[PDB]
Amino acid sequence: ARKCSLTGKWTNDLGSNMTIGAVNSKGEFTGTYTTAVTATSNEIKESPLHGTQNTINKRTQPTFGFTVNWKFSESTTVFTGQCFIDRNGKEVLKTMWLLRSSVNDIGDDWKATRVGINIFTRLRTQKE
Amino acid sequence: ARKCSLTGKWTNDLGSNMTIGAVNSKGEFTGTYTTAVTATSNEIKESPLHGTQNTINKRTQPTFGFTVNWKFSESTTVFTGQCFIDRNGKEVLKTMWLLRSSVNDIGDDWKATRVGINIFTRLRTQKE
Amino acid sequence: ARKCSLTGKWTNDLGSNMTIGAVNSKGEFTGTYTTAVTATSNEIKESPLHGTQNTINKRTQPTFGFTVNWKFSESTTVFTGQCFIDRNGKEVLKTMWLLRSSVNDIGDDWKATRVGINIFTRLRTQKE
Amino acid sequence: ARKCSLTGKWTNDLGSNMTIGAVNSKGEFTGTYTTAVTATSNEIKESPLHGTQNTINKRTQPTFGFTVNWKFSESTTVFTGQCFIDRNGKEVLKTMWLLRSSVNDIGDDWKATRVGINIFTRLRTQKE
Ligand SMILES: *[C@@H]1O[C@H](CO)[C@@H](O[C@@H]2O[C@H](CO)[C@@H](O)[C@H](O)[C@H]2NC(C)=O)[C@H](O)[C@H]1NC(C)=O
Ligand SMILES: *[C@@H]1O[C@H](CO)[C@@H](O[C@@H]2O[C@H](CO)[C@@H](O)[C@H](O)[C@H]2NC(C)=O)[C@H](O)[C@H]1NC(C)=O
Ligand SMILES: *[C@@H]1O[C@H](CO)[C@@H](O[C@@H]2O[C@H](CO)[C@@H](O)[C@H](O)[C@H]2NC(C)=O)[C@H](O)[C@H]1NC(C)=O
Ligand SMILES: *[C@@H]1O[C@H](CO)[C@@H](O[C@@H]2O[C@H](CO)[C@@H](O)[C@H](O)[C@H]2NC(C)=O)[C@H](O)[C@H]1NC(C)=O
């Protein structure tokens, strides 16, 4: 991956991992997300994500977003961040997410959306 | 569109419009977004989005997220909401977004992410 | 209340009401908040809030924030918005909130914070 | 400060410092905040904050919120977090904030609110 391609494997401050396949000339990509965390009474399932990374001004440190479609859940998480190359040539994904729960009724909407951050750095795509 | 398919045209409280093409059996879709608003010294450009709508428990009022990849900008917006069918059979998208700006340096990250909501309802896909 | 003083009674899109007493020359105020909504297995209790409204450039449409300290809950909500005087001289509070739940352990922190908006307009402080 | 009183001095991942005076039996406190960061063409000014920490169930790891009223700015920041005592007896404030800018018109509201996190740990209140 070119410095800051989202392509490859990544881990975050929560221990969550994600895999992002090749990014086409449209900035689009899909991948999978394995969350290390849930408030779920359900088996965590590696879940597909789908996104785009920015390709306006073809910036070395592009911003991006993607949706993760939980397999084990009725919710969705969207993440948006920027890929930064730090002082040591190390790629850092700085992200924020909205985690959308499925609420019963439009009147429960006010409580459906959680927010937070994640910081992702690169994992070896090659195992021992 | 089946009650609550995200497929079709939609408008939001900002006057922004979006078009969402067919949703495959994976919950995936692409579309375009025309924002009625920017803080941009640049021509607003109808911009592509890409997402997934939830299809766990095949719920009549599914949650969803998608990324919009601004053509006129270095930023990304991700939206996540739920499709609700209101008391009158009317589809309401209740959404929250994170709008990610491109900041110069990882140290500017703290200020890169704006948040807000949008409410979307359906526009006629057939013009006069 | 001078056009846009937060002082007085207000209601929001959720049916929630709040009372804000006089704002001192520091921009500070306290008040009470009665939420029309909870996900709580507990009696909703009118709860105290405490805040400040902005008083830099003494702007007619000042921004502000305050904390509500739920009496019936271990959580806190903070709201921040701006007071706008609309096209018809009508005061509109546009706000966003972070609702902080109390989670058991620092490792549960990622899921503790909900976000959303509220829109508040003025209620008669004088009853029939 | 009792393990998890917000009272004392704190620093955050941004280098920002804050001082929080005694917390009364109402959970209320005031203090000052010196941000290490701005997007401001203005002298950063140590700015007052005002808040409450939770005191329902008198939990060792209480949640809390407070408003900072920027002296050098038309904006407000509200923070809400939880005070956690980590595996080593060390107090960690985990927080999220909404930083509210002052926008010109109610129609600019959608872009006024930034969000992010801060992590605060304790500084010596006693200098060398
Ligand atoms: C994320 O990926 C990492 C690396 O592939 C996983 O961590 C490894 O876990 C195995 C056990 O399954 C250990 O033998 C290795 O020592 C670990 N390596 C590293 C670098 O930590 C981790 O389990 C994955 N986390 C997920 C899938 O949530
Ligand atoms: C969103 O779509 C609506 C409907 O297609 C557009 O509103 C129409 O705008 C035309 C002028 O271009 C008028 O003649 C119609 O009377 C309007 N119809 C309605 C139902 O409002 C609107 O311009 C589009 N907004 C965008 C693209 O931002
Ligand atoms: C918010 O305040 C309003 C007005 O004081 C309350 O609405 C009134 O409720 C009473 C019954 O308690 C009715 O008789 C009135 O007709 C209502 N007036 C209006 C203007 O709606 C409302 O109950 C309060 N909501 C709270 C406390 O959550
Ligand atoms: C936050 O407070 C810390 C500690 O009081 C400040 O860091 C000290 O800065 C002085 C110079 O002003 C140095 O001589 C010390 O070595 C630093 N000590 C530590 C522990 O870092 C810091 O300047 C303050 N930051 C603000 C006010 O933004």
Sign (positive or negative) of CA dihedral B19, B21, B24, B30: negative
Q: Is the CB of B123 under 6 A from ligand 2?
A: yes
Q: What is the resolution of this structure in A?
A: 2.5
DSSP output for A23-66: --TTSEEEEEEE-S--S-SS----EEEEEEE--SS--SS-EEEE
Q: Where are the alpha helices (DSSP H) in B33-89?
A: none
Neighbours of A128 (CB within 10 A): 3
CA distances from B10 to B4, B46, B67, B83, B120 (A): 12, 14, 16, 12, 6
Please give the structure tokens belonging to residue C43. Answer: 């009696």
Residues 11-70 of D with CB under 8 A from A: none
Burial annotation C28-66 (CB, 10 A radius, 16+ → b, else e): bbbbbbebeeeeeeeebbebbbbbbbbbbeeeebbbbbb
DSSP output for C38-101: -S-SS----EEEEEEE--SS--SS-EEEEEE--SSSS-EEEEEEEEEE-TTS-EEEEEEEEEE-
- Span from the CA of C86 to the centroid of ligand 2 (angstroms): 24
Rounded-to-integer distance, Cα A64 and Cα C105, Å: 31
- Which residues make Cβ contacts (< 8 Å) with residue D121, sequence separation at least 6? D10, D11, D12, D90, D91, D92, D93
Which amino acid residue places its CA nearest to atom 6 of ligand 4?
A: D17
β-sheet bridge partners, residue C112 = none
Neighbours of D32 (CB within 10 A): 17
Sign (positive or negative) of CA dihedral A47, B51, D100, C90: negative
Token pair 């904030």 is at which residue?
Answer: D97
Rounded-to-integer distance, Cα B11 and Cα B86, Å: 16
Contact D50, C52 (CB under 8 A): yes
Residues 95-114 of A with CB under 8 A from D: 96
Q: Find, among C127, C123, C128, the residue nearest to C19 by Cα.
A: C123
Which amino acid residue places its CA nearest to atom 4 of ligand 4?
A: D123
Rounded-to-integer distance, Cα A65 and Cα B63, Å: 17
Q: What is the DSSP letter of C15?
A: S
Q: Is the CB of B116 under 6 A from ligand 2?
A: no
Rounded-to-integer distance, Cα B113 and Cα C7, Å: 31
Experimental method: X-ray
Q: What is the DSSP letter of D74?
A: S
Q: What does the CA dihedral D11, D13, D15, D20 come to, rounded to 10 degrees?
A: -20
Rounded-to-integer distance, Cα B42 and Cα D110, Å: 18
Contact C64, C49 (CB under 8 A): no
Rounded-to-integer distance, Cα A63 and Cα A72, Å: 28
Helix (H/G/I), strand (E/B), else coil: B50: strand
B111 and D116: CB-CB below 8 Å? Answer: yes
Residue B34 CA: which ligand is closest? 2
Contact B74, B67 (CB under 8 A): no
Rounded-to-integer distance, Cα B83 and Cα D58, Å: 39
β-sheet bridge partners, residue C122 = C10
Q: Which amino acid is at B10?
A: W
Q: Which residues of B touch C117 (CB under 8 A)?
A: 116-117
Burial (CB < 10 A; 0-12, 13-18, 19+), residue B108, is middle
Rounded-to-integer distance, Cα C110 and Cα C55, Å: 34
Q: For chain A, which domains are there?
A: 1-128 (2.40.128.30)
